[PDB]
Amino acid sequence: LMGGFGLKHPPPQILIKNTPVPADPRSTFNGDKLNSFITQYSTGQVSVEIEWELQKENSKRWNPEIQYTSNYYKSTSVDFAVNTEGVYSEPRPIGTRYLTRNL
Amino acid sequence: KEVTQNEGTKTIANNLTSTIQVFTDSEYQLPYVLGSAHQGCLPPFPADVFMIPQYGYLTLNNGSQAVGRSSFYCLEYFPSQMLRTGNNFQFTYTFEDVPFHSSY
C-alpha cells in the first residue's frame, strides 16, 4: 500500500557485525562472561546491481504527450545538484506516470 | 454509387473506379467502442438491409473542455486496404480461453 512490488520471497536481508575483541583479562580464572572489549569500527565499499525489464510504449496518439522536464528559467542553483556548501538536495518528488493509454 | 442533384431530380449511377478502405484494429490502439450496447447491429432477420453506424470516441474532460492528457486519433494514420468493386476482404480471429456461460 506504500506502492511497489509485492514479493513472497523478497531480496534477502543482509546482516553485518564487528567481531568482538576482548581486552586483556585477569591472570586468575573467573567464570563470569567477559564484559571488557577494545573499541572498534569498520568501513568499506558496497556495490549493488539490478537488472530491470522494460515494457515499450506502442501508441497511435496523434498529439504530443506530457513529459517530465526541468524548468527553463534562470535560477540560483541547479535542481538535483549540490549547493555552495556541498549539500545534495532533491527539490520535488517525481512520479512515474506521464505517457497515456486507452482505458 | 454517385448521386448528383440537378434542380429537383435525383439520379444515381455506378462509379466503377472508386474505392472504400477497411482495416481491423488488431493491436487495440483505438478507443474500443463496442460493448456499450449501441444500436447499429446486423439485423436479427436475414432479409433486412442495415445502415452502418458512425464511429466516434470520448476523451478526458473538465466540463466542456479538454485537459493536457486528452488524446486525438486520426484513423487515416493506420494502414488500411483499398477495394474497388472487384475486390474483397477477410480475416480470422481466435477467442481466448473463457469460462462457459452457465445455462441452468
Chain-chain contact of A100 with B69 (C-beta, under 8 angstroms): yes
The grid coordinates of residue A36 equal 571488557
Chain-chain contact of A62 with B74 (C-beta, under 8 angstroms): yes
Nearest CB to A102: which of B31, B77, B78?
B31
Pairwise CA distance, residues A32 & A28, whole Å: 12
Pairwise CA distance, residues A21 & A39, whole Å: 8
Extended beta strands in chain B, E state: 2-6, 9-13, 20-22, 81-83
The grid coordinates of residue A86 equal 556541498
**Cβ(B31)–Cβ(B20) below 8 Å:** no
The grid coordinates of residue A12 equal 534477502
User: Resolution of the deposited coordinates, in angstroms?
Assistant: 2.5
A15: amino acid identity, one letter = L
| Distant-in-sequence, close-in-space partners of A88: CB < 8 Å, separation ≥ 6 | A81, A82
CB atoms closer than 10 angstroms to residue B104? 3
Using DSSP bridges, classify how beta strands B9-13 and B2-6 pair: parallel, antiparallel or unpaired.
Answer: antiparallel
Q: Go through chain B and list every residue after which a break occurs, taking a C to next N gap over 2.5 angstroms, comma-separated.
A: none
Q: Is A6 annotated as a binding residue?
A: yes
**Minimal CA separation from B21 to chain A, in Å:** 19
**Minimal CA separation from B75 to chain A, in Å:** 9
The DSSP bridge partners found for residue B25 are: none
- In angstroms, the Cα distances linking A98 to A3, A94, B91 are 17, 11, 35
Please give the torsion angle defined by the CA atoms of residues A96, A99, A10 and A44, in that order, rounded to the nearest 10 degrees.
-50
Chain-chain contact of A62 with B73 (C-beta, under 8 angstroms): yes
| Chain A contacts in chain B segment 53-92 (CB below 8 A) | 68-69, 71-74, 77-78
Pairwise CA distance, residues A34 & A32, whole Å: 6
Q: How many residues does chain A have?
A: 103
Q: How many residues does chain B have?
A: 104
Pairwise CA distance, residues A17 & B29, whole Å: 55
